[PDB]
Design a protein around this ligand. Structure first.
Ligand code: CHL
Ligand code: CHL
Ligand code: CLA
Ligand code: CLA
Ligand code: CLA
Ligand code: CLA
Ligand code: CLA
Ligand code: CLA
Ligand SMILES: CC1=C[C@H](O)CC(C)(C)[C@H]1/C=C/C(C)=C/C=C/C(C)=C/C=C/C=C(C)/C=C/C=C(C)/C=C/C1=C(C)C[C@H](O)CC1(C)C
Ligand SMILES: CC1=C[C@H](O)CC(C)(C)[C@H]1/C=C/C(C)=C/C=C/C(C)=C/C=C/C=C(C)/C=C/C=C(C)/C=C/C1=C(C)C[C@H](O)CC1(C)C
Lengths: 217, 229, 165, 212, 39, 203
């Protein structure tokens, strides 16, 4: 099957019927972190959450960052947006961080207890009316009900394709955000400015010339 | 069956089947049949372009003198722009070449005219289409193919002789031939250059430098000038 | 600042010690030729001395009443006053590399106990298995907490003890 | 029976004559294991092919440099190419390591798994990255003219010629390096100096090779 | 050659090679990064 | 069967059932039949909006060069008054196209389920549903006599040609900075000095 290295041997824990059918399996565990199946279940969940919040974050970087080079949406840089936003806001940042810690803690603890038991949040009485729509959809990490409003998860023949598009765009958005961080430290300009500088002179403006990434040259 | 050396033996993959087969393959480049089809096609195409090229240089020097054929791309004039001529050549040659290559990789699959559904080219062998390409034939194909490959090999040698004689003497083929007919003992390649373990002397290149076209300064080098004498 | 310590870029005994070391190096320098090898060595020494004092004054170190850099070992006080790079980041760097070494040794022991000659692999090292475990040991904290949570990190009370336990 | 590098001594047991250029030369026994000998066969072929390629580059550039064509001598060529064009050094280094690491990692994991790079995972290609022997990857790309599948005895002859010219170019490249380290000149300058006075311009006149 | 690599696999030889590697790595770090006290 | 390249091997999932099935899929984008359904409908939609777009770019500029409220180029159509701001027109556009688009999508999901007028419950499209090819009031002039096939193929050919034409207008206008019929007039005035290679190398 498909692998991250054609020719390397696939590890025995990623070549099982419980692992081959997950999403985006390419036999990539050179550190052997997923040998414990409970650990692989937990790491599947951590990967899905990092994928989804990395896509949402990198979209919040790029689409305001692309449209600010167009006409509308005078938006500051992402390493400057929190300061301008807290100058425009109504609350200090500590109060807003406390509110988001309570609001995220409730939701994350719901997801926590649904990881610990799959049939957990469907207790009758536990919720006013959201208790019957807070179960899973037989595959943990992929909930239904109020999550997924448009009903696209219902169709079974598209479903592995939807999963694999999600995991590829998510891993790619994780690389995008780590590149946003490193590009921010090495250059000091925005990522669209880095893309414009690589398009203006590709053979002279890259990470071999920034003087930071490999300083032995 | 005549050979390139009379008395020796041809290589085992050269039976005598193809036209112009005289058992000449010292490197063994035709031992693969799938390679040998491609190289037969390439031999025919190089030979036909070189025959047309030698005829073009000869008629170009006879009919229009004081035009050095190595400078024909430079000193031509036309209201036709250079990029327009190059674009017409690009699209039309890409067309013709892809038709011929599709006949190569799929034998007998582009016989039918695409615009007119009436006309289909008859079945044939690769490299030798026929039909409208051959309206009139003098004699038999089994000798004319041999004549074609012989005149073509001779014209390939003639074209590389034209290129070297133009880079060394700076004159056309008829002018260099009249130079050799004036002083045969004094105008040869042995009479212009020599390498002895003391010193080496090579002829000066008569094509000067990068040639200035319309503001682009085309670099014009002389072929392997360090390895000449 | 913290504990009555002045910053080293503000401390005067720090500059006095810098000047004193440069004075000792130039007193050793002034008894040679200009472009000779002891002169080049002492000028490189003076260059490294000036660069080291500039780097210590740059990093925001705290000097005392004698002009020497003092370190702060309290997580909250150093994270508050910007001294986290001297104990806190070094202690987590050390715990990473020390647990790396310990986890690679533990995996080598458990790998060689399952053979007919565990002691013979302890004397003569299985180099490919040691390099495989050495490369795989970069995810040692994750594997350590996973072996902790499964109960396979510990041996039970099948251990060796004395008659009064 | 077969000619040995050192007449009179028998060849070692691990060198049989199946290999191209097998003269029984292993006095330090570096290849007693068959897998280590397999790896060293491929390393010998890679070093040999790079030395042939680089040595032809040395010879052609020096022929072009002695006659007044403006070519640099090979110990100055990288500097004058980076400075003549507007090429930055580290970006060309990193692009070289990108392309070379791609190709060389394909070769590495085809040594590890001896048929695996022709699974179609690279773009669509199959059996054109399947090897034929250790160090002999002839398909449609690497052997386009197709000499490794017709006249197999002539192909063994070409294997012998390839290993011999490769060893000769390896000692030639070591020659260029040590030759320039002693004389401080381009190699065909040294050839012309040897042709001027053979009896007096040689390695026993430098003061470097024998310092007595 | 198999026995020579088995001897090189022994404990004091590998301890020598590994401590030479570790000490040399620390020495090269302290050369190119002279005198690190913080960070 | 006509191919995009005669003699080439055609994919097995392309079988002439679609209008304009010439076997052209070198990137193998439609091996899934469900994706092929979505791509056929999206080809029809992009093609028909491209046909209306190329007509709306040609015909006002073709009438402005000859003997009417505005003779303004297509890319400067936003900076004109139109009795109202463009935002309100955007809102009206999004409401009415939300209606029409969601009704067409519900036809595509369940064919035979979006046919009758909901207000006037006797008006109805006939049972020859064919998602992408409605009929009824959408064919008021009594067409589809020549059966359906040749007109479908003419529809997809004019549509692909107009998609290429609109990709044209965007590219030509972004590079040359001018209007497309003036670009055609410069190509007709002197084609041998006005190619893409000439205008590219003029920079
Ligand atoms: C393919 C056959 C072909 C051959 C053998 C030549 C050969 C030549 N061209 Mg010609 N040309 C050819 C096709 C064409 N030329 C031209 C237009 C020109 C111009 C404007 C000039 C030449 C010149 C030359 C001469 C030296 C160029 C050189 O040194 O190369 C070095 C350059 C390259 C190798 C560029 C890369 C091209 C690519 C490999 C093909 C030599 C007679 C030059 C000349 O006459 O000066 C003495 C010159 O100024 N050619 C066009 C456009 C219509 C061609 C297309 O068919
Ligand atoms: C879907 C096809 C479509 C295309 C190819 C364009 C293309 C364009 N319109 Mg747009 N529009 C399109 C749909 C629509 N436009 C408009 C209303 C406008 C206006 C009012 C304006 C444009 C303008 C533009 C330009 C945007 C350049 C820019 O820097 O924007 C960045 C700026 C903003 C996004 C604001 C470009 C010529 C501008 C123009 O014509 O200047 C030359 C302009 O002023 N459009 C409406 C009505 C809602 C549309 C309906 O879908
Ligand atoms: C376009 C710039 C350019 C210029 C000014 C030169 C100039 C020279 N070349 Mg070089 N050459 C070039 C590009 C160039 N070359 C390229 C791109 C290649 C790889 C195909 C070569 C391969 C090459 C070889 C093998 C040799 C030379 C040699 C020479 C020298 C003698 C003239 C000659 O033999 O014709 C040039 C030789 C050719 C075979 C013609 C190819 C050159 C054309 C211009 C390539 C254009 C392709 C490009 C993509 C467009 C002369 C200084 C000779 C020398 O003295 O080296 C020490 C020699 O032996 N050249
Ligand atoms: C090894 C034992 C140890 C000791 C003796 C100290 C001592 C101190 N800590 Mg530190 N600290 C430690 C380890 C220690 N720390 C560890 C392991 C952590 C990580 C959990 C911290 C994280 C930390 C933070 C975030 C802060 C301190 C602070 C302090 C200072 C005052 C704390 C106090 O008044 O509560 C009595 C002391 C204890 C109960 C000992 C344990 C300390 C706990 C872990 C934190 C106590 C913080 C305290 C509640 C906040 C006081 C706010 C201050 C403005 C009054 C005091 C010097 C505070 C400071 O910076 O003051 C200038 C402060 O804000 N520490
Ligand atoms: C010059 C001596 C020489 C000889 C006899 C061979 C012989 C062989 N090569 Mg090797 N090769 C060489 C040099 C040589 N090579 C160099 C320098 C490289 C690095 C570029 C390679 C890289 C290479 C690869 C990647 C492969 C081969 C393969 C082969 C085998 C079949 C192809 C063939 O028959 O070509 C015959 C060779 C010649 C006729 C030599 C021509 C010499 C030229 C004309 C010199 C002039 C050009 C130069 C730039 C100046 C055959 C054993 C293939 C194989 O093993 O398939 C199973 C294969 O895949 N070779
Ligand atoms: C056990 C107590 C102890 C501690 C905490 C230190 C700590 C230090 N010593 Mg000291 N030293 C000690 C004992 C100790 N030493 C002993 C016993 C001797 C006599 C043998 C010395 C003699 C000595 C000398 C001569 C020098 C030091 C130096 C240093 C500094 C080195 C930093 C470094 O190596 O770069 C960083 C190290 C690395 C990057 C390697 C780790 C690699 C991993 C992968 C990094 C992971 C990070 C995440 C560091 C503060 C140097 C110094 O300048 O001090 C200011 C120095 O020149 N030490
Ligand atoms: C964007 C609108 C669009 C869409 C949705 C399609 C979709 C389709 N085409 Mg069509 N095609 C188009 C535009 C489009 N095409 C244009 C503009 C031309 C003229 C060049 C063609 C010429 C053409 C031929 C000759 C054939 C098809 C065929 C097909 C079908 C199978 C091929 C496939 O799976 O690719 C799916 C296509 C996409 C997923 C669109 C990719 C868009 C890329 C990413 C844009 C890249 C930029 C662009 C190059 C500029 C599929 C229904 C085959 C068929 O059976 O016809 C019914 C067939 O034989 N197409
Ligand atoms: C010009 C290319 C073209 C062709 C050959 C077709 C052909 C077809 N269309 Mg399609 N259609 C097209 C463009 C085209 N259409 C465009 C641009 C749109 C978006 C408005 C549509 C939207 C559409 C719908 C909603 C329906 C059809 C249907 C049909 C089928 C029967 C109707 C008919 O025969 O009209 C033949 C077309 C012409 C004779 C073109 C006339 C040119 C006009 C008069 C020019 C307009 C003025 C211009 C802008 C200046 C037939 C396959 C129907 C169907 O399939 O029912 C089963 C159907 O319901 N089409
Ligand atoms: C697999 C494996 C396995 C084997 O065994 C081994 C190894 C190899 C080791 C491994 C690997 C790993 C890795 C690579 C990892 C990575 C990760 C990442 C990168 C993540 C990110 C991740 C990322 C993320 C989350 C992110 C997110 C983001 C966000 C939200 C953002 C936000 C924002 C915005 C909007 C803007 C504003 O102004 C600000 C802010 C606030 C800033
Ligand atoms: C066999 C055996 C066995 C037993 O057991 C033991 C013993 C005896 C030890 C052994 C032996 C060994 C030996 C002899 C070895 C040698 C080697 C070599 C010399 C190599 C080289 C090798 C070599 C090589 C690769 C080389 C390569 C080269 C090159 C690329 C070059 C390049 C270049 C050029 C062109 C020019 C420019 O401008 C620059 C440069 C860049 C400079």
């Amino acid at each position: 099957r498909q692998s991250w290295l054609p020719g390397s041997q696939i590890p025995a824990h990623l070549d099982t019927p419980a692992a081959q059918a997950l999403a985006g399996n390419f036999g990539f565990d050179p550190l052997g972190l997923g040998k414990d199946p409970v650990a692989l279940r937990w790491y599947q969940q951590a990967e899905l959450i990092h994928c989804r919040t990395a896509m949402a974050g990198v979209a919040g970087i790029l689409i305001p960052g692309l449209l600010t080079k167009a006409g509308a949406l005078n938006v500051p840089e992402w390493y400057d947006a929190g300061k301008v936003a807290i100058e425009n806001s109504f609350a200090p940042w500590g109060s807003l961080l406390a509110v988001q810690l309570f609001l995220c803690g409730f939701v994350e603890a719901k997801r926590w207890q649904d990881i610990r038991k799959p049939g957990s949040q469907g207790e009758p009485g536990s919720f006013l009316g959201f208790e019957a729509s807070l179960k899973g959809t037989s595959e943990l990490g992929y909930p239904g009900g109020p999550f997924d409003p448009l009903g696209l998860s219902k169709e079974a023949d598209k479903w592995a394709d939807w999963k694999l598009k999600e995991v590829k765009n998510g891993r790619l958005a994780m690389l995008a955000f780590l590149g946003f961080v490193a590009q921010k430290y090495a250059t000091g300009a925005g990522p669209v400015d880095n893309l414009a500088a690589h398009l203006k002179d590709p053979w002279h403006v890259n990470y071999a010339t920034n003087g930071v990434s490999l300083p032995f040259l | 069956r005549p050979l390139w050396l009379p008395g020796s033996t041809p290589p085992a993959h050269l039976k005598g089947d193809l036209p112009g087969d005289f058992g000449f393959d010292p490197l063994g480049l035709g031992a693969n049949a799938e390679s040998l089809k491609w190289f037969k096609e390439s031999e025919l195409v190089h030979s036909r372009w070189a025959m047309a090229a030698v005829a073009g240089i000869l008629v170009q020097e006879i009919v229009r003198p004081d035009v050095f054929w190595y400078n024909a791309g430079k000193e031509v004039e036309s209201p036709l722009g250079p990029l327009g001529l190059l674009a017409v050549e690009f699209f039309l040659m890409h067309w013709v070449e892809v038709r011929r290559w599709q006949d190569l990789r799929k034998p007998g699959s582009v016989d039918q005219d695409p615009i007119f559904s009436q006309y289909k080219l008859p079945p044939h062998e690769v490299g030798y289409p026929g039909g409208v390409f051959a309206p009139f034939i003098p004699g038999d194909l089994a000798e004319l193919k041999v004549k074609e490959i012989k005149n073509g090999r001779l014209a390939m040698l003639a074209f590389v002789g034209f290129v070297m004689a133009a880079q060394v003497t700076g004159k056309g083929p008829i002018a260099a031939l009249q130079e050799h007919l004036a002083d045969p003992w004094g105008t040869t390649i042995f009479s212009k250059a020599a390498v002895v373990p003391g010193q080496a002397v090579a002829p000066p290149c008569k094509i000067p430098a990068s040639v200035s076209y319309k503001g682009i300064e085309i670099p014009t080098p002389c072929f392997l000038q360090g390895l000449w004498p | 600042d913290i504990a009555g310590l002045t910053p080293c870029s503000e401390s005067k005994a720090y500059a006095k010690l810098e000047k004193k070391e440069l004075k000792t190096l130039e007193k050793r320098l002034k008894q040679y030729e200009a472009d000779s090898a002891p002169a080049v060595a002492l000028k490189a020494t003076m260059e490294r001395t000036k660069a080291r004092f500039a780097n210590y004054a740059k990093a925001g170190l705290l000097c005392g009443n004698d002009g020497l850099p003092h370190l702060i070992a309290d997580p909250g006080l150093a994270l508050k006053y910007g001294h986290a790079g001297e104990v806190f980041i070094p202690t987590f760097g050390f715990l990473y590399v020390a647990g790396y070494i310990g986890y690679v040794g533990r995996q080598y022991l458990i790998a060689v106990k399952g053979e007919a000659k565990p002691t013979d692999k302890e004397i003569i090292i299985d180099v490919p298995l040691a390099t495989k475990l050495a490369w795989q040991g970069a995810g040692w904290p994750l594997a350590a907490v996973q072996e902790l949570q499964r109960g396979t990190l510990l041996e039970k009370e099948e251990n060796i003890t004395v008659s009064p336990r | 029976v077969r000619p040995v590098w050192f007449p009179g001594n028998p060849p070692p047991a691990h060198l049989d004559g199946s290999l191209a250029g097998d003269y029984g030369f292993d006095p330090l026994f570096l290849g007693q294991e068959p897998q280590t000998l397999k790896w060293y066969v491929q390393a010998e072929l890679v070093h040999g092919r790079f030395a042939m390629l680089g040595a032809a580059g040395i010879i052609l550039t020096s022929i072009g440099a002695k006659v007044g064509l403006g070519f640099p001598e090979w110990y100055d060529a990288g500097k004058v190419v980076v400075e003549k064009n507007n090429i930055d050094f580290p970006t060309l280094m990193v692009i070289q390591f990108y392309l070379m690491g791609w190709a060389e990692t394909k070769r590495w994991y085809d040594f590890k798994n001896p048929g695996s790079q022709a699974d179609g995972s690279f773009l669509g290609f199959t059996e054109e990255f399947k090897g034929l022997e250790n160090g002999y990857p002839g398909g449609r790309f690497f052997d386009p003219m197709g000499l490794s599948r017709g006249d197999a005895a002539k192909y063994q002859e070409y294997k012998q010629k390839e290993v011999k010219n490769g060893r000769l170019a390896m000692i030639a490249c070591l020659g260029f390096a040590a030759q320039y380290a002693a004389t401080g000149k381009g190699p065909l300058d040294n050839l012309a100096d040897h042709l001027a006075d053979p009896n007096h311009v040689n390695f026993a006149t430098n003061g470097v090779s024998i310092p007595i | 050659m198999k026995d020579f690599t088995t001897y090189l696999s022994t404990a004091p030889v590998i301890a020598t090679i590994w401590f030479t590697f570790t000490a040399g790595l620390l020495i090269e770090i302290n050369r190119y990064f002279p005198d690190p006290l913080v960070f | 069967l006509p191919s995009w390249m005669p003699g080439a091997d055609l994919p097995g999932y392309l079988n002439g059932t679609l209008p304009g099935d010439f076997g052209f899929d070198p990137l193998y984008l439609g091996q899934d039949p469900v994706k092929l359904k979505w791509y056929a409908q999206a080809e029809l939609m992009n093609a028909r909006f491209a046909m209306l777009a190329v007509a709306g770019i040609l015909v006002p500029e073709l009438l402005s060069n000859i003997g009417p409220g505005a003779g303004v180029a297509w890319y400067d159509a936003g900076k004109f008054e139109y009795f109202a701001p463009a935002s309100s027109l955007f809102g009206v556009q999004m409401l009415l196209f939300a209606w029409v688009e969601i009704r067409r999508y519900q036809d595509f999901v369940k064919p035979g389920s979006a046919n009758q007028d909901p207000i006037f419950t006797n008006n109805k499209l006939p049972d020859g549903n064919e998602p992408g090819y409605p009929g009824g009031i959408f064919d008021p002039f009594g067409w589809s006599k020549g059966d359906i096939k040749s007109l479908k193929l003419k529809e997809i050919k004019n549509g692909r040609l107009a998609m290429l034409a609109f990709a044209g207008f965007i590219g030509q206008a972004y590079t040359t900075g001018t209007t497309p019929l003036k670009n055609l007039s410069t190509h007709l005035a002197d084609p041998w000095s006005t190619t893409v290679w000439q205008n590219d190398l003029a920079r």
